[PDB]
Structure 1
Amino acid sequence: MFTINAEVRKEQGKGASRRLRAANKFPAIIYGGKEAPLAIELDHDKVMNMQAKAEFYSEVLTIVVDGKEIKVKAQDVQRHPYKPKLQHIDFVRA
């Protein structure tokens, strides 16, 4: 059972998102259902390792944000053009 630690993003747009990745973090988004989308930021190495196991893309994951647990599934993923890296992830509330 995957557990991902996230903080809500304080900024948005291109500048903020590139600064995240220069800092070994990367943006992501949680949408679905009744609640509003929740823009977040993730630790790159931690999620990189996780998603190298097929289970990630097919299991109910739990994102922890301010000590709250959100149950999600991976929905889309943007990868770097040619490095073993993640640019962004969509999670849909499960």
Structure 2
Amino acid sequence: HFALNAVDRSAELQGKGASRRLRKQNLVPAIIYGGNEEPASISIKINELVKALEFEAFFSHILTITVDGVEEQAVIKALQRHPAKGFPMHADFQRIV
């Protein structure tokens, strides 16, 4: 319930057109920032994130992002969803310590 799988988002999938083209692949951009090191840009599958968001305790508990290997303890801080269609569009995660 509190573990989600993610993939790396490199510099070529970053930007306006790249984010739009990535959301057309059923993916949600997200940034993991905080802790004591640089932020990491990841991509989370849209259906996985929607299911995770259905749980109301998902917003106030420690989450585990597994980026195909390296794993991070995080807390969701911001979630921008579509103003009208309502689907999630970008996620912020704060690395806990």
Please classify the TM superposition score into its range, dividing by the shorter chain length.
over 0.9
Distance 1:67 1:42 in 2: 14
After superposition, the C-alpha distances for 1:33-71 in whole angstroms (9 at most, x for unaligned) are: 211000011100111111111111001000001312100
After superposition, the C-alpha distances for 1:16-40 in whole angstroms (9 at most, x for unaligned) are: 1001111111100000021100001
Please give the TM-score of this superposition, normalised by the length of structure 2. 0.91
* Most deviating of 38-47 and 2-11: 2-11
- Paired residue type of 1:54: E
Distance 1:3 1:40 in 2: 15
Q: May I ask how many residue pairs the two structures share in their alignment? A: 94
Unaligned runs of 5+ in 1: none
Matched, 1:84 2:89: no
Please give the TM-score of this superposition, normalised by the length of structure 1. 0.94
Question: After TM superposition, which residue ranges in structure 1, 4 or more long, deviate above 3 angstroms?
Answer: none
- Report the aligned-residue RMSD: 1.0
Which structure has the highest helix share of the two?
2
